[PDB]
Amino acid sequence: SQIGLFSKICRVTIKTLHYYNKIGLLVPAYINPDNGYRFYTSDQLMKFHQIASLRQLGFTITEIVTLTQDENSCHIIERRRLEIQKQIRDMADMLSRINHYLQHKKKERIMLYQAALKEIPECIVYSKRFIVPDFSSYIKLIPPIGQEVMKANPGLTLTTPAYCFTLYHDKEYKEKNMDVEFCEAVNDFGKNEGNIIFQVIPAITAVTVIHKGPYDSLRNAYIYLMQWVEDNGYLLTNSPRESYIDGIWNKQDSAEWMTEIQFPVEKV
Amino acid sequence: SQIGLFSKICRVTIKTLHYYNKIGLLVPAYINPDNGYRFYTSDQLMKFHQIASLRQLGFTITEIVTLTQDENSCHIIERRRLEIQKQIRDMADMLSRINHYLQHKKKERIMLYQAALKEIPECIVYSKRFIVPDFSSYIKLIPPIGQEVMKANPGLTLTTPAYCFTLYHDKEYKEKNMDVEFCEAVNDFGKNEGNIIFQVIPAITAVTVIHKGPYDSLRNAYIYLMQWVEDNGYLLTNSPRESYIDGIWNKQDSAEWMTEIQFPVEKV
DNA sequence: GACCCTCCCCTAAGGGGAGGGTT
DNA sequence: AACCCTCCCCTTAGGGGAGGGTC
Ligand code: 118
Ligand code: 118
Structure with missing residues (x-):
């Protein structure tokens, strides 16, 4: 049978038959020497049935080849x-x-917020843990904490890019007191002193959002992510992080500051 | 900031940023015309976050381009x-x-048997339905049906390819006293003579198996498909068909005959 | 040393068309 | 008018490399 009739016996296109001949999957019985026409037989249909049966299960062409020609495998x-x-x-x-x-x-x-899953590698930071009555006081007290460590350490070179963040070790947030930690990422180890120390922070897989504006709306971000982990069947496995991107140290207008909220989660 | 640092901030490759700038997504802030470099700002991070968030939901590039600018749609x-x-x-x-x-x-x-789903379109057939004591008497009594209609209907043409089959109208699989109908597909209508009738068989979706060899073991095929429909959560809708591809009219070696069992089914 | 640019070819399973040949 | 063949480019979301200029 010619190629056009065999294409109607099998209900398949002609370009598919040309492709299968090129790959080496279904070779015709006899090819005309001067014309080059293709003629087929019944056993070709017996094999095309097997090809389609394998293709309907999702196998790729190479696995189909290895399945038909080779041992059972x-x-x-x-x-x-x-x-x-x-x-x-x-x-x-x-x-x-x-x-x-x-x-x-x-x-x-x-x-207003869009969440995305990403991966944060492990890092080495210097850190300070303490209790805070009010977040503004925490903002006020951190720059001397930076000054002491930057002056009293040899070769304290920050990373590229800059990763500085805050760890919340409390289970249910409250405005009265806050067990917080300040962390900033550095390159190498060194000597410890005072209330500040060096430590490694392991890698996590976290869902993140980005908040733009002043800090007095930051809680509106958390209420979002507490929903996202509740609906989509995830579990909060570790302490959240608050990383600082754009603030008073680069800009003058507080309505163009920028921060990032990160929740480490697992699939449960 | 230059592109090599921004790719570290975004945690992607550089080819990704080049491709995005080419297709018109996240075009950089300031391109210097002398050397041709790309400089990115902190304004681009809050757009890359949105791009990745939309990309994590399976959307395609053109959909993301259409979404971020036509947000009403x-x-x-x-x-x-x-x-x-x-x-x-x-x-x-x-x-x-x-x-x-x-x-x-x-x-x-x-x-031996490899099942596969396929579509069968509607057809015009001439048919004859009766009771037989066995299958051998059926095989022997067929050819008069083919001779008579050709005698009384001059110029009646078959189809290409040929479709010649039989229907088993009985509810339970049997071996004797079978209620069977014989159908052959033609191109145009005609007139009825006696029990020979003309009708139209509708289109179906069917799971098919090909049997090769002598007729007597064909029952095995009817077993296998009957397992399949039960095993994979399907429901049989209509009478099975038995369609003849290769037989005594083309060959003498009975080990080269080919027939096809087709079960019309539905995903229930 | 370290960074950056443009230009060309590649992925899986065919699809669409241009141009030439025979009855 | 109908079939048939071969050659060339096209589809996704970016990867890989060569050659050459810039900080
Ligand atoms: C130690 C402690 C805090 C800061 Sb920073 C900062 C630095 C780099 C990247 C992002 C943030 C700061 C503040 C004023 C002037 C210069 C630098 C800082 C301040 C408030 C809240 C979070 C971080 C720096 C060192
Ligand atoms: C009407 C009735 C039977 C046949 Sb056939 C047959 C021929 C070609 C292609 C397919 C089927 C037949 C057999 C012997 C001699 C002449 C014609 C036929 C007979 C029995 C079972 C199945 C098909 C044809 C028309």
Whole structure:
């Protein structure tokens, strides 16, 4: 049978048959010497049925080749059964997250915060832990904490880029007192003194948002992420971080400052 | 800041930023015309965060370009929400079919029958329906049906390719006293004569298996598919068909005959 | 040493078209 | 008018490298 009739027996295109001949998957029975026409037989249909049966399960062309021509090779099959099992979960994750998105967007018709999952490697910081009655006092007391360590240490060179942040060790926030820690990232180790010390901070996988404006609205960010971990089936595994990007040290207008809120989470 | 530092702030590659600047997404702040360098500001971070957040939900590049500037248009979100569910339903079916494949090949070292789904369009047929005591009497009594209609209907042309099959209208699989109909597909209508009738068979979606060899073991095929429909959560909708591809009219070696069993099914 | 630019070819499974040949 | 063949570029979201200029 010619290529045009065999293409209607199998309900497949002609370019597909040309491609399969080029790859080496389905070779015709007889090829005309001067014209170059292709003629097919019934066993070609017997093989095309097997090809389509394998292709309907998601295998790629190379695995289909290795499955038809070679020995049974069961180890290829189970490797696909994992690749599906993982993939479903990913889809089942995204269908959740988009359902959050609409559920907020159609509520307000404007989006102030957008969350994103990312990875933060491990670092080496100098740090100071203490209790604070009011956040403004914490802002006021940190620059001398920087001055002491920068003067009293040889070769204290910051990182590129700059990573400076605050750790909240409290379980449920309250404005009265706050067990806080100040951390700034450096390159090497050294000598310790006073109430400030060097320590390593391990890597995390965190959901982050970015807040723009003054600090007096920062709580509005947290209420968002406390929702995002509750809807999409995640679990808060560690202390949050508050990293500082743009402030009084680079700018003059407080309505153009910029900070970042980070929640380390796991999938539960 | 130069591009090599900004790529460290964003935790992406440089080729990504080049590609984005080319396609018109996140164009840099200030390009110097003498050397051609790209300088980024802290204003670009709050847009890259949004790009990555939209990208983590599965959207494509053109969708992200259309979203960040036409923000009133929100039906793309539903357009993606439906496709997510469709993909989930497809993967959950591929998983069960892979499981059936491994379960079948587990105990039996090799497998003969490989099922595959396909579409069959509507057709015009001439047919004749009756009761037979056995299958052999059926095979012997067929050819008069083919001779008579050609005698009484001059100029009646078959289709290309040929489609010649039989329908088993009985509810339970049997071996004797079978209620069977014989159908052959033609191009144009005609007139009825006796029990021979003309009708139209509708279009179906079916799972198919190809049997090769003598007729007597064909029952095995009817077993295998009957397992499949039960194993993978399908429902049989209509009578099975038996379609003839290679037989005694083309060959003498009965070990080269080819036939196809087709079960019309539905995902229930 | 360390950084940066433009330009060309590559990915999987075919799709679409231009141009030439025979009955 | 109908079939058939071969050659060339096209699709995603960026990767890899060569050659050459700039801090
Ligand atoms: C030690 C302690 C605080 C600061 Sb900074 C800062 C530095 C680099 C990158 C981001 C922030 C600061 C303040 C005034 C003038 C110059 C630098 C700082 C201040 C308040 C809150 C968080 C950080 C610096 C060293
Ligand atoms: C009407 C009735 C039977 C056949 Sb055939 C057949 C021929 C070509 C392609 C497919 C089928 C037949 C057999 C012997 C001699 C002449 C014609 C046929 C017979 C029994 C079972 C299945 C098909 C054709 C028309």
